[PDB]
Subunit: 64 residues, 3 copies
């Protein structure tokens, strides 16, 4: 399905098309596609995760 | 021009101001400005490209 | 507060929930949360800054 919504009572903006979503809340911003591609922004920083992440042609590998 | 639109018949949300665009589809999310700055998110990962990309002050150079 | 708005006279789309904002203008796109987490996209490239930035589990440290 698809949802585009802005609500204040409880404060959220959501844009969604199936599994692709952008959400804004007082805690920050999340962009995601499916279950494992996610960019999250919060007051304290940013997390970027993806099965493959490429930045200007160079792959950023996983660290555990 | 400028466009902000949500459509389901065919499933897409688009936010555009001239050459700056964010689009959501069932395939993922794309953010772009002009023809060569792009962040794309898909089920399988993320690509980030820009003439200059800086992350926390450090430049990420191009790899071919 | 919360704001979701599209204006053309002067050309801007803004999505905001308290300190979390996404703005599109002819100059590009900015996503931010609070005062120091920011992703900016412009015709010339991309800047990503956050108190902590992690990409696929690896921290990207600050360079001055």
């Amino acid at each position: 399905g698809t949802i585009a919504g802005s609500v204040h009572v409880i404060k959220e903006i959501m844009l969604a098309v199936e599994e692709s979503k952008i959400a804004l809340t007082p805690d920050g911003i999340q962009l995601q596609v499916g279950e494992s591609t996610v960019i999250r922004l919060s007051k304290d920083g940013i997390t970027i995760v993806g099965g493959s992440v490429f930045i200007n042609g160079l792959e950023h590998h996983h660290h555990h």
